[PDB]
Amino acid sequence: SGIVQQQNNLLRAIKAQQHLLQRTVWGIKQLQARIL
Amino acid sequence: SGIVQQQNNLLRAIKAQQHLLQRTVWGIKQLQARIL
């Protein structure tokens, strides 16, 4: 709840969003391979 | 604009990027269902 904890929290959200984003990249590449 | 104001900015941007991510997931799943 302090500023330090919240910065640690935002870092963790970005780290988890980076994993989500990577999995979406893999999905697009898969479809692109099947379509093309 | 200061550390507190910058932290609220980052939080708000991360929250809206999550909305973006969810919608890209929905788009991939739509294509995937249609293709397969």
Binding site: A16, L20, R23 | -
Partner: peptide, 21 residues
């Protein structure tokens, strides 16, 4: 596998929603 992929999506999704409470 799309089944594997689907699970990881809902895993990381709920992890994020828990982080943004």
């Amino acid at each position: 596998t799309w089944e594997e992929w689907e699970k990881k999506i809902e895993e990381y999704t709920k992890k994020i929603e828990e982080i943004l409470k």
